[PDB]
Amino acid sequence: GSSGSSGKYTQNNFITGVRAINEFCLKSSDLEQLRKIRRRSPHEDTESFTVYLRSDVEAKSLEVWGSPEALAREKKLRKEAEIEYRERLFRNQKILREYRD
């Protein structure tokens, strides 16, 4: 059989690969360099994936960029981006309906 994946965003003890490569902005060769954990094969006969340790990926960003501040510079933008979106949406939703519109 087969099985796709889920969307949305969520933080846990473990972080996906592509999720860290896009967030921490690293190289595919760097991630693979880290320890490859498969949750001790929590489910067989099904397409699995490799997960990395948040603590490990963190250092990988400091050893490359040099410091966590260098990366934060890019994180800020991506962060404010979503805010700028939901922002205009907030006022568009309003608290309720009042008077004509």
Curated annotation (Swiss-Prot):
<protein>
    <recommendedName>
        <fullName>Proton-coupled zinc antiporter SLC30A9, mitochondrial</fullName>
    </recommendedName>
</protein>
<comment type="subunit">
    <text>Interacts with GRIP1, ESR1 and AR.</text>
</comment>
<comment type="similarity">
    <text>Belongs to the cation diffusion facilitator (CDF) transporter (TC 2.A.4) family. SLC30A subfamily.</text>
</comment>
<comment type="function">
    <text>Mitochondrial proton-coupled zinc ion antiporter mediating the export of zinc from the mitochondria and involved in zinc homeostasis, zinc mobilization as well as mitochondrial morphology and health. In nucleus, functions as a secondary coactivator for nuclear receptors by cooperating with p160 coactivators subtypes. Plays a role in transcriptional activation of Wnt-responsive genes.</text>
</comment>
